[PDB]
């Protein structure tokens, strides 16, 4: 996809993610789990109810056709109005097919960007208090409980706090 | 149908407080019953072979 996550630089989808279209996996030592990110999966469900809404409050009003009789001498009117209604009847079947074509493009594409920034969104918070592993998943160089997987996962992750600790394993792995 | 004559037949539309008046020595097919307008609306002629299947 154009955002490179989904199917991507993260290889698959988890069954185990039932609550959330985007979310997180953890471990440590009190164990592990999955955690739906429930801002990202609210603003992305918004986006796509309006979606459907806008396509189809666009073709309320479409071209409605009308039964209307000639006789054996009004060929050339007959005509005109068979062309007429059939003629709006191509548009509107083109605008609609276009547009669902276009729309889920696009639809697949927002989940995918989706996807990529709330990656982003822990990569900019653990900077090098973790490490990348380039699979979608970060591995601390501190200890990180329960309370302080929630801090990433809700954006409240405190740097400052654990940066000295792990400065100090850093060190120590970059010493062999 | 049997018939080489032809009949011809041609309607219009009367307007409240308006006189219809027909004058003729022969060929006449008179009028009988008319039809009063009593409820206008939204309507279609259906052409369809189908008939009637006793739902909404
Ligand atoms: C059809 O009939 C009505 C009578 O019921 C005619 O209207 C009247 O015309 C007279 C004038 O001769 C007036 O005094 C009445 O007030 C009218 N009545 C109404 C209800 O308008 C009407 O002219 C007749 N139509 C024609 C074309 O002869
Ligand atoms: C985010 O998570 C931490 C858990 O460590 C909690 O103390 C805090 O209340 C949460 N804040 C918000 C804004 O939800």
Known sequence: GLFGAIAGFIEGGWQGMVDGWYGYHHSNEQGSGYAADKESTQKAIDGVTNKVNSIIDKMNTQFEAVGREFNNLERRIENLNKKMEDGFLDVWTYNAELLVLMENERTLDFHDSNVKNLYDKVRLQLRDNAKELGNGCFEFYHKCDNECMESVRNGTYDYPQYSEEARLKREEISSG | ?56
């Open chain 2, 1 to 56: 149908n049997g018939q080489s004559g032809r009949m011809e037949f041609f309607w219009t539309i009367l307007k409240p407080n308006d006189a219809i008046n027909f004058e003729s020595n022969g060929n006449f097919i008179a009028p009988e019953y008319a039809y009063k307008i009593v409820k206008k609306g939204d309507s279609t002629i259906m052409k369809s072979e189908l008939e009637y299947g006793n739902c909404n």
